[PDB]
Amino acid sequence: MWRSSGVSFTRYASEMAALLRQCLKEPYRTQAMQRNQIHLKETVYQQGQVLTRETFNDIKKAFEA
């Protein structure tokens, strides 16, 4: 489904672990979604001369973009 959909196993595993964390009980779910927030800042280069810079706070948009 993933080698056909052009998707990696890591992406699939992460996006499914997200749902499994959403299916948690609130006391442990708090610590789970706590320990699994996201904050990244991608910076693309081409022989110097930065092409773009973009922030990421979600797993889905981080794998998509």
Binding site: W2, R3, S8, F9, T10
Partner: protein, 52 residues
Amino acid sequence: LTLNVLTPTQAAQSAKEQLNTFEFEPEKTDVWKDLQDFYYACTVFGCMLDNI
């Protein structure tokens, strides 16, 4: 440290005879592409923990 990491070109250039001792529940050709991403992820994980 410096880790020489395996890549798909280097996997295709090898017949992977060293893993014949292991029984892969899906076939090797079908599970290799999913195993290699896990390998990549685990490599970065431990390296960055040690660096931290």
